[PDB]
Design a protein around this ligand. Structure first.
Ligand SMILES: OC[C@H]1O[C@@H](O[C@H]2[C@H](O)[C@@H](O)[C@H](O[C@H]3[C@H](O)[C@@H](O)[C@H](O[C@H]4[C@H](O)[C@@H](O)[C@H](O)O[C@@H]4CO)O[C@@H]3CO)O[C@@H]2CO)[C@H](O)[C@@H](O)[C@@H]1O
Ligand SMILES: OC[C@H]1O[C@@H](O[C@H]2[C@H](O)[C@@H](O)[C@H](O[C@H]3[C@H](O)[C@@H](O)[C@H](O[C@H]4[C@H](O)[C@@H](O)[C@H](O)O[C@@H]4CO)O[C@@H]3CO)O[C@@H]2CO)[C@H](O)[C@@H](O)[C@@H]1O
Ligand SMILES: [Zn+2]
Length: 472
């Protein structure tokens, strides 16, 4: 059976199925409707930064077409929709004046979702820091971000929280730290060798610390001011790809564990246990900021659920841990990536070079969180794969590899849940082909095809797969 035995009956009662987008990747109207620029607007408008010098000015134009898109997700039998609010659409300068037209958009979207029986899961932040805050404060390098983000979050809670009961603060802070401050390939393009300045050995850690403190501050505000009346929940979205020891050697097993700790433990040990992973403390030393006892107590337990974006897996090979001059967050792990074992690749690649199709990584990640962190409530907040550029419409629609991807990965998730993992929901990245950051429109992650000339939507085979799988 093309469903491979999957259906709602194969998952827990009340298990939530949804699709996901982010504001800059789908909304369009980037410089309209009162929206102020984000760091991604400036970045994308700079020649050479994005494939084909493309940007999110129009994207999928969900801003105008959101009722079409909500109708479509309802027709595909989804229960929920994860989307983000653009900070600079609400506060064009990141602070101060409210853009009422932007508020009205999200009200209209939220209300239509609810009208159609689709639960809104709302991210406050998805890489799109208001440009004014980058320039004025230095963005996530500045501890003042906790105050600035908390005030923004407060507004969103007050304005939308009578209707929105499922929030996330951040999306993949590890990726902001890594690409924005270690490698310097994403905004603000900081790194040791970078024109904008930076230090790949220190700044990723400062940035991660400020994300954790800002998350904790925003949640403290929710709990003290809004929770009694609104009775919702606030979590965070973290990326986690699996690491598997290349062999059963002590060294390789240690390397895979170090990778897990530097990847997910960086955020989860603070959120669950109130401290950074021991290995990071041991290796990063004075470059890793230290939580005060008060801050640690604020961060610990501050996520009502853990959003995990899960895509892929890698083999890890070890080495003797050495004393080394610090160079970068990436180099701090002291591991070696390997994508074959016993002469066989870990899996075939999707369009994105980093995305190896490895369904057992889903089981790996979910089981690991279950066993290591006391089985916290987890929501899979993003999982999917991409097709390349330049295919015909019909080639996009016949997305047999993506159908296989979802069947296999969801089978592996089901395996983990059946073994007792506390997973509450699953969200497919993405509802729509969209603006895929540095790849621009050359990477197609949607279950729904978007023609970027006409903006027409066409469900792909994988959309119909979900429709069949999710029928009530
Ligand atoms: O319909 C609009 C649109 O759909 C697009 O997607 C198609 C797929 O291309 C097509 O393969 C798929 O066919 C499914 C069918 O819907 C299921 O009912 C059926 O499930 C069987 C299963 O195979 C058996 O083993 C099991 O025992 O019983 C069930 C149910 O009887 O499986 C087939 C695949 O083998 O349907 C999708 C949606 O219609 C098309 O590409 C496009 O042309 C259409 O315009
Ligand atoms: O992309 C689709 C969708 O998903 C969400 O975020 C994605 C990012 O878009 C993507 O850039 C990021 O890719 C990571 C990848 O996970 C790592 O496996 C890879 O690791 C590197 C390592 O950094 C190097 O030091 C080493 O030498 O090589 C390895 C293997 O290549 O690093 C890349 C960064 O380029 O993955 C995220 C999820 O995992 C977003 O939520 C959404 O907005 C995106 O559209
Ligand atoms: Zn339009």
């Amino acid at each position: 059976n093309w469903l491979g035995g999957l259906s709602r009956a194969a998952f827990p009662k009340r298990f939530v199925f949804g699709t996901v987008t982010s504001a800059y990747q789908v909304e369009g109207m980037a410089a309209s409707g009162g929206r102020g620029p984000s760091i991604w607007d400036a970045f994308a408008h700079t020649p050479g930064n994005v494939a084909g010098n493309q940007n999110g000015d129009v994207a999928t134009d969900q801003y105008h077409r959101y009722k079409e898109d909500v109708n479509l997700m309802k027709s595909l039998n989804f229960d929920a929709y994860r989307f983000s609010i653009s900070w600079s659409r609400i506060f064009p300068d990141g602070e101060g004046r409210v853009n009422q037209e932007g508020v009205a958009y999200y009200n209209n979207l939220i209300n239509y979702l609810l009208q159609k029986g689709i639960t809104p899961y709302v991210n406050l932040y998805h890489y799109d820091l208001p440009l004014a805050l980058e320039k004025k404060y230095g963005g996530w390098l500045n501890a003042k971000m906790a105050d600035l983000f908390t005030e923004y979050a407060d507004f969103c809670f007050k304005t939308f929280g009578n209707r929105v009961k499922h929030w996330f603060t951040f999306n993949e802070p590890r990726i902001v730290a890594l690409l924005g401050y270690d490698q310097g390939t994403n905004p603000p393009k900081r790194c040791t060798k970078c024109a904008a300045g930076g230090n790949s050995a220190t700044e990723p850690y400062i940035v991660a610390h400020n994300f954790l403190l800002s998350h904790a501050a925003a949640v403290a505000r929710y709990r003290t001011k809004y929770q009694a009346a609104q009775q919702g929940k606030v979590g965070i979205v973290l990326d986690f790809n699996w690491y598997e020891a290349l062999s059963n050697s002590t060294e390789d097993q240690a390397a895979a564990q170090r990778a897990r700790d530097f990847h997910i433990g960086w955020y989860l040990d603070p959120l669950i246990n109130g401290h950074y992973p021991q290995i990071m403390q041991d290796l990063v030393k004075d470059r890793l900021p230290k939580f005060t006892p008060e801050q640690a107590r604020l961060v610990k337990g501050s996520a009502d659920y853990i959003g995990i974006n899960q895509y892929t897996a890698s083999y890890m090979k070890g080495q003797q841990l050495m004393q080394q001059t610090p160079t970068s967050y990436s180099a701090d792990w002291q591991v070696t990536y390997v994508f074959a074992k016993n002469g066989k690749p870990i899996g075939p690649q999707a369009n994105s070079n980093w995305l190896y199709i490895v369904p057992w990584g889903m089981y790996g990640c979910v089981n690991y969180i279950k066993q290591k962190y006391g089985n916290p409530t987890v929501v899979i907040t993003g999982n999917g794969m991409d097709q390349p550029a330049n295919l015909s419409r019909d080639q996009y629609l016949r997305d047999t590899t993506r159908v296989h991807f979802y069947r296999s990965y969801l089978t592996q998730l089901k395996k983990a849940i059946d073994e007792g993992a506390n997973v509450a929901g699953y969200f497919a990245w993405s509802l729509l082909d969209n603006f895929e950051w540095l790849s621009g429109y050359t990477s197609k992650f949607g279950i729904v095809y978007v023609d970027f000339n006409t903006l027409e939507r066409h469900p792909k085979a994988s959309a119909y797969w979900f429709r069949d799988m999710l029928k009530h």
